[PDB]
Amino acid sequence: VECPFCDEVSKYEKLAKIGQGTFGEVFKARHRKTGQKVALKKVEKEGFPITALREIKILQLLKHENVVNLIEICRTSIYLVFDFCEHDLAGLLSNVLVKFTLSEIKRVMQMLLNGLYYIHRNKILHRDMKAANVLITRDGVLKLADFGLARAFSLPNRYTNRVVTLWYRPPELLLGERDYGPPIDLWGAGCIMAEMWTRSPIMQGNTEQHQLALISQLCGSITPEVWPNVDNYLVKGQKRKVKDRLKAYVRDPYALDLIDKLLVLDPAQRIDSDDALNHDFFWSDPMPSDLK
Template identity: 50%
Template sequence: MSSSGANNSTNNTNEETKTTIYSMLTDQPITIPDSCLFGTCRPVSEFEKLNCIGKGTYGVVYRGRDKISQEIVALKKVRMENEQWGLPISSMREINLLLNLRHENIVELREIAVGKSLRSIFLVMTYCEQDLASLLDHMSQPFTEAQVKCIALQLFRGLNYIHKRFIVHRDIKVSNLLLTDSGCLKIADFGLARQFTLPNGTMTPMVVTLWYRAPELLFGIMKYFSLKIKIY
C-alpha cells in the first residue's frame, strides 16, 4: 500500500462521526459531532418502542426494550410542544430529583436518551407491569387485609424516604403508584414534586389532583401545602 493510501486510511479511521439534529428555535438542521450531542446520553435509537402504556400532562410513556442489554424499560417522552427554550421546568425538577433518589419503593431513573431532534428527550426508567389504579379497576377479588398492609407499608417507606430528604411529592394517587409482578410498589411521576430546606416549609396547594386533596385544601381552610397534608 502506498504512503498516501495509508494516510487516507488513517484519516478515515480518526474522523469523528457526526449527526444531524434540528434546532428548537429555527427547525433548521445542524451537524454536530456525536460526542458533543450525546455526551453521557445514549441515542433513543438504541431502544425499541414496544407499545404505549400511558399518557399524562407531562409526557407519553412507552414500554421499550434496550437493544443492547435486552432489558425491558419504561421510556417517558418529555412533552415539548409548547417549549421554545428547552426542557419544561417540571421535567427538569423530576430529572434532578430522581437522579438523587435511590430506594426500592421509588421508581428509578436509569438514564436520559435523546433523539435526533432536541425536542425528542426520553427518561429511561424502571419498568413496572401495572399501576395500582388499573389493577383496582380490573380485580375480580378485592385485596386481602394482608395485601393492603403490604402495599401501605411500602408506600409509607417510600414517602418516609423522600420526606427525610425534604421532598414532597404533591400528587400521590393510585395511578402514580406502580407495581411490579413481584408485588414491589414504586412511587412515580415526580413532575409536581418540590424540595425545600425547612422541614415545616409551605407550598402552594392548588397542584394536587382535585379529588385527592385533603379536605383542608379542597375547601380552602389551609392556605399552604405542607408534609402534614400527605397523611390524608
C-alpha cells in the first residue's frame, strides 16, 4: 500500500529514551543523513486516539518561534516528530548551578508571553501551563510545548474543568468554571514568572480546597467586591500579600507589579499577553537580553 506522505521513522536513528508520553515512549533521535536531532513521541478502543488527533491538528496550526515545532508524523505505530530541545524551565530552575540575571528573566517572560499571544490569537488554549512545559533550545529560544491537553476555543461554552495541573490552576477552574478562555494560561504565566525568582512553585496545594486556600493566602480572598459575581457556584479574612510574600525574592518593582497583574483573581481583570508585553518590565533597564 503506497504512502507518499508518511515516511517511515527509520529515517531517524533512535539514540536514547527520554521519557514515556501519553500514548507511548519518547526518544531522542538523529536524522540518518544530516544528523539533525529530533524527539520522537510514539502514539485504543476507538481507533486512532481522538486526543492525539486534536494535538496534531493544533501542532499543525501553530507555527511560531516560541511554539514547539512538529516536523512531521512518521509510521512504522505512529510517531510525532519534533525539533529536539535540550532544556526545560522546570529543570533549569531546579538547578542551583543555573543562574538567570534580571535581564534574561525579562527575556524569558517576553518569549513566553509572545508565544501565548500567538496561540490565543489562533483560538487555542494551552491548558497545561507549567515550568516543565516551557522548553529552551541550545540557542536560548523559549518554546511552549506539550499541547496534548490544549483545545480550540470560540464564542455558552462548556469546556472541561479537568484542565491544568493543580499548582498552576486558576481560581475560575477551581470554582468550577466551564466557560473559560485565555486568562487561564496567563494565570499560569504568573505562577511561572514568580517561579523565576523563587525557584519553586509558589502555591503547591494537595487538593482543590487546599489550592483554593493557598490562593487566598496569597491573592487575598475571593470577594464579590474583588471579583464581581464570583458568588455563583472558603476563607473570609485573607488580604492580598502577593507583593509582600514575593517582595523577598524579586526585589525589582516592575517585576513585582507585572506578577501582581498576572495573579489577579477575576479572570476578566487579569492582564492579557498583549498588555503584559507592553508592561514597563520589558521596557526599562536592564533591557531584556539573550540567553547563553
